[model samples]
Each structure stands twice: as C-alpha cells, then as structure tokens.
Target chain A: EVQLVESGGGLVQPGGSLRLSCAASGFNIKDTYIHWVRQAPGKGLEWVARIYPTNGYTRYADSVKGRFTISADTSKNTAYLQMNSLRAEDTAVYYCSRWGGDGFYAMDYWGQGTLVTVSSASTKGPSVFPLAPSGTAALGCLVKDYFPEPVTVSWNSGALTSGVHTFPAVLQSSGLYSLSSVVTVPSSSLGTQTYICNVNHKPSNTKVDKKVEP
Target chain B: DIQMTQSPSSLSASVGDRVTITCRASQDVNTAVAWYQQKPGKAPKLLIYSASFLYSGVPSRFSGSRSGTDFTLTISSLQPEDFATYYCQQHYTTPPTFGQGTKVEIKRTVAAPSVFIFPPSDEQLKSGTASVVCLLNNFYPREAKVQWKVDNALXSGNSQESVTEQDSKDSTYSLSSTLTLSKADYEKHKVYACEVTHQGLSSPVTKSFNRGE
Candidate 1:
C-alpha cells in the first residue's frame, strides 16, 4: 500500500507566492513520478505540473507553464510546487498524484487536498444576480466576480428551500474569480414571493445577500 | 502538443444497440490512449487505458482498439445506464490533450408520460392563495414543453417551469411546473390541466385536476 499526503496551503495576498508540499510513503519515491493537480473552488480539475524524481525532468500544462514550478526530492520522498505572483483566481485546492506507469501518464493515486487562497478586500459580489427564470418554475441564480473562493451560496425565505445548485468558476484574464450557480424554484411559490441568496466568503468571514422578487 | 479529435459529437441510440466512438490524434500516440466516461454531477471515470487495455473491473462490453494515430472505443451492446459523455486522452505526449467529448444519448423513443399533481398543504390551501405543482416523470431526451390551463383557458399568471433533467441511473427525465392561484379559484373547483408536448410523443400528454377532490 502507498500513501501520499499534502500540506502547506494557506491564504496569500494578491501578488504573493505559495509553496505546497506532498510526501510519499510505503513505496520507493526515487523510482516514481509525481504530478500536481488543482481545482479552483466550484471549477473543473486542471493538471498543473509534474516531475520525475529520478531524472529531474519536469513538464507543465500550457496554461500554467512559466508561472509555476514542480520539483521532487528523492532523499526526502517528497515533491513541491512553487507558484509566484499569485492573484485571486489562484485560490484553489491543490493535490499531488503518482503516475500509474513508468513513463509520465495517468494519475492512479492522489494525496489529500491543500487549500490556498489569495486575499483581496476588493473582491466584488458575483455579477449576474442569482436565479434568472429559465422555465416557468425554474429560477437560475448566477453569481460572478468574487475571489479567494470556496464561497458558499444558499437560498432562504422564511426557511431554507431545497434546490439544485452548480458552481463552475472561471479564471478570467484579469486574474480574478468568476462563477455562477443556478437554483430552480417552483412557480406556484413565486406570486408575491421573495427569495434571498446568501453568499459566504470563508477566508474573510464575510457574507453578501442577493434578493429575487416575483 | 498532440491534438485529439472525436467524431459524432452527439448521438442517440437505444439499449442493445452497437455504439462506436472514434478518436484520432494529430500524431502517433503508440498505445498511450485512455478513455473516460463522465455523467452529470459526477467525476470522469477511466474505462480503457494503454490503447487497448481495459481498466480493472470495467465491463467486457467496452473495448478499445488503435492503429497508428487512430483509436476507437466500441460498446458491444449499449446499456441504458451508458448514456453519458465520453472522452479520449493521449498520454504519449507531455501535458496530455483530451478529445472533445462525445455524448451518447438514448435513441429518441416515446415513453407514455406519468403525471401527478401536488398541492399545498391544507392550511396553505385555505389561506386564500396556494401553489399547485404539476410533475411529469419518466420522459426522454430532456426536451419537453409544459403549459398550464385553468378552466380550459391558457393561464398567463406567475408560473415557473423546471429544466427537463435526466436521472443518472436510468437516463430517463423528469420535469415539473408550478402554478400559483388565488384560493377563490381553488374553492370554486376551477379545472386545472398540465399539458406536456415532446418530440417522442404523437401529441401532447395532459393531466387534469380540480381542488374539490
């Protein structure tokens, strides 16, 4: 059995840097390849960088190239990721994985995630108001323009209503966070009705509310 | 970087049908191909790797073949649960590239509609206003139109319709519409109807109800 553990993720101010670590056990680290993967809060998985401990060869995803560095230390059975000039969009959960084959390839095993956030007081609330009506009974709540995320959004009236929500955040060219979530409410409940969306930003312990009225 | 492309971006097929999805790399991948399946609200799952090797415990019906830069993943007999998006990746090159996904869908078929009405609780029903829900279940293709009629006339009041969404396990869909009305309408036993129209149906399917019941 093999195990990989990750650590060293914390909050960094915009334009700061971060260094994350992954340690391996129960196997020979010198002979295996380690790769780094990241997922911004409510976003898709992205391959960031990878390194071969034995040969010291390194490769990075086109999007992350030149902005990040991946290195491994066989003597310590660990790998490290160094990223500089961070922005609010750089906030994400970072994970380290082991290649399944001899050559650089698919990840078969992964480490526990480490969350890194870039702090920015100027981070604004999502652009589109949450919950635009798509169908007669469906309301979509789209929130964008926030940063250092993992933000939580919930619906409330007199009580919490159960609905499906999706958040897919995109890293914009300006290096900020933009994402949206949609909630469907029954139309029968909308007449003279009002719904409130509460967005919680954990890092700053802040909350914002957007209201939908019918 | 090697570019990967998949054919037939989307297709509709029935269970027991033979389905083949093809992927081509800009250059030779040399048995370094992998295939994955992604379902709604789920992570992508590995099905095949190393060009033709099946991942542990994958169904035998799924097979992969490769010749030079071309690779194919064939499902011998499509299963109802296999409706999802499929992707191909090439690991032969650094910073592996993935093919655009191919969506496998249930061949368009007409399944009789199952409909139900859910009214607000008795207390709210007596409050002079209430919400009535019309639910349409076990439909296909995620494309259906729902309309509300009160007393045989089209209702234009505050109403909402849900997106037709499929169940992950069965690939069938369910949708609902909500109509808000004054308690006077409910007390008068005004007839209510939910009419649903779909490409799979010969005509619209409707369910009618009245509050007196």
Candidate 2:
C-alpha cells in the first residue's frame, strides 16, 4: 500500500498560469504514475491527464488538449501538472493520484489531495479547506434559491429504495432560494460512497449528485 | 488550473466491486471543475466535478460531491457494465488539469456488440429526393470525423463531412450528412459505413443504415 501527500495550496489570478504537485511517501514513486483531476463548484468530474514519474511519459484528456501537461520527478517521488491561461471557471479543487500500472488503468494508490483555488491573486495563498476524514460518512450541501419548495435527496454509494429525501425550501433575505440536505452512510462506505441532492424544476429540470465519504 | 489526486494503488476484486477516488483541490475553487472516466480505446466520459452536478444521460450510480476542497467519485453497487478507468479534471482555470485514472474491474461480464453510425448531411437530402439524414447531435472533442461507404466499397465522392458546433452549455458540436440515392442506388447498392474518427480516441465508431426507398 502506497500513500500520496499533496504539496500545498495557492491562489491564482484569472488569465494566469498555475502548477501543483502530489508527492508520494512510503512507496517508490518512480514505479507509479501520477494523475490530475478537477472538481468545480457544482458540476461532474472531468479527466485531465496523467504522467509517469519514471520516464516522463504523459497523456492528457482531449478536453484538456493544449491547456494542461503532467510531469514528474523520479528522485522526489512527486508528480506535477501545469495549467496556463487561468480563468474564473477554472477555479476548483485539484487532486493528485497514483496508479500501479504502465498505462491508463485503475489506481492502486492515491495521495491526500491539495486544494488550489483560482482567485485574482498573483502569489500562493493560504490553505483554508480541511483534509478528508477517513471512513464512510454523510455531509450536507448549501442549498440555493433556484431550488423548489420541496426537494429530494438520495445516496448513490449503494442502492436507494427511494431515490429522494424531501425537504422544505427556504427563501433567503438576499431574495435567493436555499435548502439543506443530509446524507447518511456507514464508515465502510468511505472512498466508495456517493450521495446526491436533487431539485424539482419543471420542463427544464436538473439533478445534482455528490460523492459522500467520511 | 489546480491539481487533483486518487488513492488505493489497485484492488483485486471481481464484477460489481465498489470503488472510490478522492480528489482534493489546491485552492478554494468556487465552482469550476469536472470529473471523467476513460477506458482503453475510448475517449474519456464526464462523470462528476464542479462539486456535485450530474451531466445528462449519465447513470445515477456515478456521482460526485465536495467537502470544502476534498472531492470524491464513488461507484455504488458496481455493475458488470461499470468496469473502466476513471479520471477527474478541473475547468476552473484557464488551462484545465486532471487526475490520473482509476480502473474498475468486472467479472462474468460479456462484451456487447460494437456499432457505429454516420452523420446526417444536407447534400444527402435534395429538394425532392427521398433521403435519410443522420444527425450527430451534442457531441464533444470535434475529433469524431464522418465518412461514407457504398456497396461495401469505400465511396470516393465527397463522402467526408466536418462536425458543426457552437459554444453551447455542453461544449459540444454536431455533424450531419445526407445519404441520398434514387430507387436504383438504394436497392442495388448497400450504402454501408465503416468508421468515424475523433481525437484522443483510438477506434472509430461504425454503423450501417438502409437507404430510403
């Protein structure tokens, strides 16, 4: 079993360039490949690319074509990915991952992720987010006004007899809508549990799902 | 763009084995990231990102969530059809960043028969000719190229078409091609298609359709 520890966090301005790293410990990083992933404010997952720490081999997702590159240092057991021409929509948490194979495949190991927030700042900033807790657990989401009077909630890590947990919607002073949902799961569900919160919008509708863990 | 990571070197499990990949952000990215899954010989498919929004046509079993900067991709009740590598990408920055990938292994699963289709085009539909138009709608990468074949032989006539796209919500484009023929060409020759090429992908999707009567 290998462990991954992210280097640090920083604040990047719009239209700027940014680079980050994920260092491996307790294992030979040179034998593994490092990958980068992103999570925006309220969207699904997007595959960026991967880099082999041993031979500098790399591959980027087509969606990430010219914008990103993955590199690594065999001596340091660390992998790096750099993104140029930053934008506000680019602001999201990024993660570093380790794999046990030669090419694209499953991850046998991973590092604790480092959070990089893209703001209009030139220098690296402070780390404000908490590290992930171990094990399966439930969390709540900050609801917004666009949500209807009653909403549905469900867990995805496993089967849900009913895909909805309804809750009353709250109207805020800012004239926006808001609601809250609680997802529950077992500690064993960590790293493999996903919870979803959905809103009822007619005609044009949308549902939001969240990965839940302890 | 920020960097993301996934854990657990690799696991030895059979079909329907649940797995998880945790993604952590480098900063407080308010709302700008996404996740995806890719298998050998196929382009990456969007899974979750931007915290917790689901893309259309995606199965409910695939979900995403974020706690502060820590994000997770979890597969609940894994199915035989869920075996594939997973990845995470961020769009909150100018250039995007992605996590390595996680492969989901399945057992006792049979591979499905692969099929490909063609894009509908204007040339295939004349003013009054009976024709069939195949429209490749809301597609991404713009790498998938369209081609035409006739009677099991590669057609040499302007049989290639480009994908038409606009800056819509899904960052995707569509390609269309028309296959028009008189009753003779429709019945005598079988207008078969063999491939559609795209970037980041290795194989072309092929499909054959009957000509309009």
> Evaluated with DockQ, which candidate comes out highest?
1
Worst 10 residues of 2 chain B by lDDT: B107-116
DockQ of each model vs. true complex: 0.08, 0.03
Write the residue-wise lDDT of candidate 2 on B123-212 in tens digits: 323322222223344444444555666666775543223333221233344454434344444456656564556553457666666544
If you assessed candidate 1 against the hidden native complex, which CAPRI class would it receive? incorrect
Encode model 2's per-residue lDDT on A126-174: one tens digit a residue: 1111112221333434333352222344444336533122223433343
Superposed by TM-score, candidate 2 places the C-alpha of residue B63 at a distance from the truth, in angstroms, of 18
Question: lDDT (CA) for every model shown?
Answer: 0.70, 0.51
Residue A20 C-alpha lDDT in model 1? 91
